[PDB]
Amino acid sequence: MLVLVLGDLHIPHRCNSLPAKFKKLLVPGKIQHILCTGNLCTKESYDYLKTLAGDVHIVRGDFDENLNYPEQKVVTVGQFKIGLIHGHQVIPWGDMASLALLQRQFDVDILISGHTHKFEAFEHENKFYINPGSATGAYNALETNIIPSFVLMDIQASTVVTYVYQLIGDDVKVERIEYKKP
Amino acid sequence: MEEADRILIHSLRQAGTAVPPDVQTLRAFTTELVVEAVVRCLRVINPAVGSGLSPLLPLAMSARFRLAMSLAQACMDLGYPLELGYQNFLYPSEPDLRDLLLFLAERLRRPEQVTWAAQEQELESLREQLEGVNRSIEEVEADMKTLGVSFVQAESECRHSKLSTAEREQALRLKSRAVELLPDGTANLAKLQLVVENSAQRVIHLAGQWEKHRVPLLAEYRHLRKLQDCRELESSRRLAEIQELHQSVRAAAEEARRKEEVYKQLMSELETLPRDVSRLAYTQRILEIVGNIRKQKEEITKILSDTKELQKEINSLSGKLDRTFAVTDELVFKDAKKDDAVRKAYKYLAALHENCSQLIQTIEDTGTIMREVRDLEEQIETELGKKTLSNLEKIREDYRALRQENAGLLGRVREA
Amino acid sequence: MAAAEVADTQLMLGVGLIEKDTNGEVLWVWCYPSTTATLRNLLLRKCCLTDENKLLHPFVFGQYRRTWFYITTIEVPDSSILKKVTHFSIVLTAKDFNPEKYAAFTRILCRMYLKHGSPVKMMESYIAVLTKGICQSEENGSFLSKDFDARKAYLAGSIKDIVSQFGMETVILHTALMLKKRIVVYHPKIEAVQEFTRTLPALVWHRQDWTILHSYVHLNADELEALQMCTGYVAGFVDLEVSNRPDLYDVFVNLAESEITIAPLAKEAMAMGKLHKEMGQLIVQSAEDPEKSESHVIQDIALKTREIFTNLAPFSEVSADGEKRVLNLEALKQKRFPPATENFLYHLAAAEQMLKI
Amino acid sequence: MAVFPWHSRNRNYKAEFASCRLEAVPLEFGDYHPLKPIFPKHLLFRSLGLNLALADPPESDRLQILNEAWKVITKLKNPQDYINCAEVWVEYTCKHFTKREVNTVLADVIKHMTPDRAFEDSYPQLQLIIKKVIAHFHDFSVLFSVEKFLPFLDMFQKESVRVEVCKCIMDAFIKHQQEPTKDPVILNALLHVCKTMHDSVNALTLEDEKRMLSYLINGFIKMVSFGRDFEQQLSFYVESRSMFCNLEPVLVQLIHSVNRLAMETRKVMKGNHSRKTAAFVRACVAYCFITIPSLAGIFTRLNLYLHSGQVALANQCLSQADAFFKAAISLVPEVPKMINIDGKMRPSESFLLEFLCNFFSTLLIVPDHPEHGVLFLVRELLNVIQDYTWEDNSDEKIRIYTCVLHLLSAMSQETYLYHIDKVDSNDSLYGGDSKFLAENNKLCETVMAQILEHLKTLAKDEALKRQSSLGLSFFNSILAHGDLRNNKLNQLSVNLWHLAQRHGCADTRTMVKTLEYIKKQSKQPDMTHLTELALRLPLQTRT
Amino acid sequence: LGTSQLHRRKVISLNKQIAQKTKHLEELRASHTSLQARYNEAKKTLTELKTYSEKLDKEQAALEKIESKADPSILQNLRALVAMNENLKSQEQEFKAHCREEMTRLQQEIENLKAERAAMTHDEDLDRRYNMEKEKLYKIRLLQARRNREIAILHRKIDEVPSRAELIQYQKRFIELYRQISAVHKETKQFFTLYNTLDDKKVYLEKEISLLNSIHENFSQAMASPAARDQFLRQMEQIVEGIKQSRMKMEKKKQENKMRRDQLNDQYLELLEKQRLYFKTVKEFKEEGRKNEMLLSKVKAKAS
């Protein structure tokens, strides 16, 4: 099942278009679900997403003026519960220990963060934790440069195959893992 | 615009024109002050002209005009959007001056056949024996081959024969043994079986002894292995630790060098830096202003409400008034029909409500007129900001002086 | 009866064992046979536990220089043995075939040891079998060699299953087998190799020689030499590299493949002429013809064997050496067997060690 | 149990990274992935306009007809017929021929309409005319060349009508304008119209109309762009601010723009920050700084404040950030018990805490003033927070207390969870000052005092579920941050775990799975004292 | 005399080859002879083994002859037992030997693990070194903190007096701020006037309705009798008189404010015309300057 996960688009202030080949990679319709950790900021960006695939969910980050987005969500695809947060909720931003704290709160197999601003993808405690980075490469105040990066994953029941897209000029680099439900 | 007065201070400081004590406003100035500033302004910005006219004040009044015309030209250096000239350069309204000043501040039968034969015969004689020897050699080679095979053959048969002989020896020995056992077969059988079983018990004994001998050796082995690993891990860990600590210490020394040298730079910077009024001060001032904005905005906001409710009150009143007058006037006329003086009371009803409308209207008019008053007073403010009468007095005396001057010039033209 | 038990209790020359400890290492641990330190090293090379889990095959049986050897590994299952034992690999050494009966006696030994921990009581059981060819167990119902005649061990092989798997590859296999030719089997699963290869002595078994079954040969020089002692031979292997070697092999079987390989001259000696067509027919029936079980298939292969032996028999004279016949192979060609039948006759007379030269 | 001082676990986030990270394989050139893209005159005039729009002879003949018809029309003094029929013919005229052909019509329109108010009566016709222009005309620069449009605008009086035109015009502009560039004239005209809209605004106008209008303005605003001209960009912004006072959200855009300009300028300079760079920096800073007060949306203003903060952090403006914090602080009391958004009132405290959360992290990233008390600011913020009239469900307070301990833990770290560029922090100076560490711990202990106090109070309050969760977090935090080598604290953690279980409103499933997690973590070597904990932790259960 | 050198040369070659090959023959023949003796010897040995083997066979037949005298079963059991005992002696004795053997072997292996061990002092000295590094690192960090203190002090000192560049935005801000100050406050007070307006409108709406209803009912009461009706006529003329007094007071205010408005407006117009005069006189003076400079051109040319 093809599902799209994104965060912290910062569209109007930081990132008023997605780049060319990344946009291109967004073929509509070959995605089943869409999950946004927040700070995509605009309803119209969400429109562009919903036109990319209908099954959109968004949790409230900072700049998302729709405060009605939930702070968090437990989405489930394949056999995995999947926890959603804007890491602006993450105490030391990125603490693995806090991440497992979240998991134990919600008993979820995957979690995705967005507010953190490195590329992050740790699985330990046999639970998995993700930062795609900003797919628009919205500047990290703590950092000198971030390439925009985004992932789609082949979630298949007890297993998930990662596809870790990076745009490097015209270079769309990709990385794979398979996560599993042991 | 006292903040802009602080810009005056700013402009004076940047120009190097002083701020004499009451020179806290444009109001203070003489024209020279400004026009000097203009001299500085291009002399910084367009020296080619700007070098032209000394900050020295003129006294040839014509030079005052013409230098001022150079000021207009200085505006023409870019075209500040408004009118230019000595008229302005004489003592304009402070807004105008301020604006232009800002415009400035910004940009800163033959023998062979007989005997040769007998010679070559000597070759042939040896050639034949050579081939015969080679024949014999090949023969002996064949013989050695065959005999070696045969020899190995005999070797193989000998080995097998030995094997058979050993088997016969063992079988014969056993058969003799059985013959030895023949007289007491049953008793020998039982005795020997018992012997075998006891010997196996003795085997069991030794297996226990050898077991028990064995175990300590292994336990010690285990011990030495365990301490081996612990040592090996320990050493690895201390080594890694000290590697890291050394590297970090190195980086810290690098930073110390950088920090120390920068610090002396900072010493130089402290030496250089001025001591003006602070970021904070303006911050405070702004915030004050901010508060001002908030408060009066909010007061306007209450007023917004006040208007809303007040009008809906008036609305209710108007409806009640109209229905009131309908009912009242109906009854009054119904009564007026009875009698002429009741009709006079009805007359007073209509005239009274009319007079009400009259007074109301007059009040409205008063409001409007007072709005006019606001407008007029604003315009008065405008013209006094034009220093208007004083500027009359200025141009009267100026034009007087220059008319008189020009009359003298006409005289000189005719004379000279 | 008892004479066979006394032979066997000679052959069963005793038990091997290797284990692993917690200090960090797998180790040999003492046991009870007539040791050979060289051969001991060889057996260690047999030891699956030598790689803690390459494939920790929990049981192996084996034969070396006609000496059989028998093996069990369970790492450590739940038992009251000394917990220092992290892994275990129990073994025995023999000159005899009853792998199943050994599995029984070993299971007895092992479980007894799994209760006690002491190997010496288990050695009492070694002694018991030694003295009687039988053992009781405290942990188990008793075991008798009388339970398990060698021919029971021989019955276990399904020839139908193999022949239905290998068709004319089995015609390759046959033509190598009869003629005393060098047979190799490769599958990485030692369990499957064990099953298939041990079935392979069942084939033609009436032409009895069970000692052939050296179920685990290493490529070591001494081990390859030992296999060289054999000529008609079947040695089992779990890697491809033996396929490299038709100089070494007359056949390479990849049991990982279901494939059987022809050696260079075998491509004539096993070429599909008349007798090898007859064998193609017989093996197609050995898949297809249902009438006869593995031992019955052995009986009909014995029919073909008597055919070839009787072809040799009057044409051959019985030598002054008495045991065996000398074949007028020239007269056998005067019989004018169509060429593959006559060739198979010659190569089997070599396999019968009944040539004339 | 005395005021037993918290002491912390030590952690190598880098080692933790290497352990927890999964290493993804760099995928092969062109390899698969699921979305790899592998009978009066005018009557006939108008009737003829319909026929010609439908069918016509060649363009030359159309031109001839245009000349004849419009010439007569100019002769036609009657304005109503003139406007009515011209509206129809206009579409056809613009459809075929270039600008000037119509420009003549424009001139004569201006002539006929000028002397008499009736053009105001003809306001709709003027609107439709321009709408037709819109459909037929799409390149701005030509309209600027078609200067007749300015007299066209000038001809009007009715502000509202004009405003309508503006809405249409700018939406069409947006549909056409897809080029992020500039033209001063283009800017000038647009800005003039914008001010028309802005000034059209009053306090009384509907907020929704305000919003939409603003939003449109906002769109072109995004489009506004002069590339590499920070100062020009800046100034334009400044005045924009000056005029476009009528709606703050709009201004936030400007704010954002400032930020974007500044940050990118910073990046392109690559630390090679000249005097110009830093001054520019500070100016962005201020402009922004001053803006927020001008604004209204407090919460929004707060996150704006922190952005201001972080950019200053990005831009070396410590005390400046401090000021902003004081401001945030000052906003803190401002936060009312309920706030209205979407027309609706919601418990802000949830939201403010969310802010507070990201802020707290933000705290340690700061280099403090030597003069100022080491993180005094932090205490001020928290204390004030507590000073807020938090009702029940204060526990969120307790959550922050927890997390504050996580921060305190980072300060406790001789090395911080991240280190940013040129940024300094007390670590960067003090490198594990024992004294600082101790004081921090003391502060932690203060929080821990509050922790014990309210938790057992909640025990008095029978708030057993909420309190239970609070203990859940407390133990969880202790786990993350602590060393049970304080055997006393380890035991108090047991006291917690069973105390929670002895009141029992907690989710026993949570506790069971929790304990299982405790043992799973305890398995590690250092965790052997956690192993001592996790076994020494039995568990009372709803089960 | 017909004679060839090739005869000579190849003759010598042939003799050499003959002789050499013959010697090869001799050695090969000797080897043949030696192997012949060797092979024959093997044969003899073979015959010898056969004869001895035959003696063994004779011996076996005789021993088998003696054995025939009794139950073969008993004999077989005894033989088996003999072999059993033999095997036991063999493995037991051998095993004894292997017990000693393996004891020695492990003893040796342990002797290895001992000599392997019979890094720690290194570890201590490494700890010492490590401690020294941490210690100077802390004192270094002391200097870092101090220097950093200076860094902050000097930075703040720089920045407390912001750049003229900074001032730029400052003042333009101030400028809008004044604009706002004025605009807002004037708006504000004018709307306050608006308040006064609607306030007064409401007040008299209230008073009007109240008086209307009151006087309506007083009419209703009074009209009942001619005397009280006429009394209502007079009293209402008095009430309208007071109302008209309010009207006239408002009109008087209108006139007074009108007078103020007139006077100020007129002054305004006066000043407007005068300001026009002043700009005119500005022009007049500039004309005086132009005339001045023209005359100056004349004067300098003429006089100078």
Author numbering:
A (entry chain N): 1 to 182
B (entry chain L): 1 to 108, 320 to 627
C (entry chain M): 1 to 357
D (entry chain O): 1 to 38, 459 to 963
E (entry chain K): 309 to 426, 446 to 631
Give the text the authors published on this PDB structure.
The Commander complex, a 16-protein assembly, plays multiple roles in cell homeostasis, cell cycle and immune response. The recently discovered multiprotein Commander complex is a master regulator of cellular homeostasis within endosomal transport and the trans-Golgi network. The complex regulates cell signaling by modulating trafficking of transmembrane channel proteins and receptors to the cell surface and diverting them from lysosomal degradation. We report the structure of the endogenous human Commander complex determined by cryogenic-electron microscopy (cryo-EM) and comprehensively map the molecular context and interactions of the Commander and individual complex interactions in human cells using affinity purification with mass spectrometry (AP–MS) and proximity labeling biotin identification (BioID).
The CCDCs form a long heterodimeric coiled coil with three flexible corners and three major coil regions that we call the I-coil, R-coil and V-coil. Two high-confidence crosslinking–mass spectrometry (XL–MS) crosslinks between Lys373 of CCDC22 and Lys352 of CCDC93 (I-coil) as well as Lys598 of CCDC22 and Lys601 of CCDC93 (V-coil) support our atomic model. The NN–CH domain of CCDC22 is wedged between the C-terminal V-coil of CCDC93/22. The C-terminal half of the V-coil provides a hydrophobic binding interface, while the N-terminal half provides a hydrophilic one. In the complete model, the Cα–Cα distance between the last residue of the CCDC22 NN–CH and the first residue of α8 is 23 Å, a distance that accommodates the 12 residues in the linker between them. This is the only covalent link on this side of the complex between the top and bottom halves, which highlights the importance of the binding interface between the CCDC22 NN–CH and the V-coil in terms of flexibility of the bottom half. The I- and R-coils are oriented at a 62° angle with the N-terminal side of R-coil harboring the binding site for DENND10. The binding site is composed of two interaction surfaces, with a hydrophobic groove between the CCDC93/22 coil and the corresponding hydrophobic patch on the NTD (or lobe) of DENND10 comprising the main site, and another mediated by electrostatic interactions via Glu19, Asp21, Glu25 and Arg40 of DENND10. The putative Rab binding site of DENND10 is occupied by I-coil. The inherent flexibility of this region, however, may enable binding of Rabs in another conformation. Although the binding site identified in the homologous DENND1B with Rab35 is blocked in our consensus structure, the flexibility exhibited by the C-terminal half of DENND10 may expose this binding site.
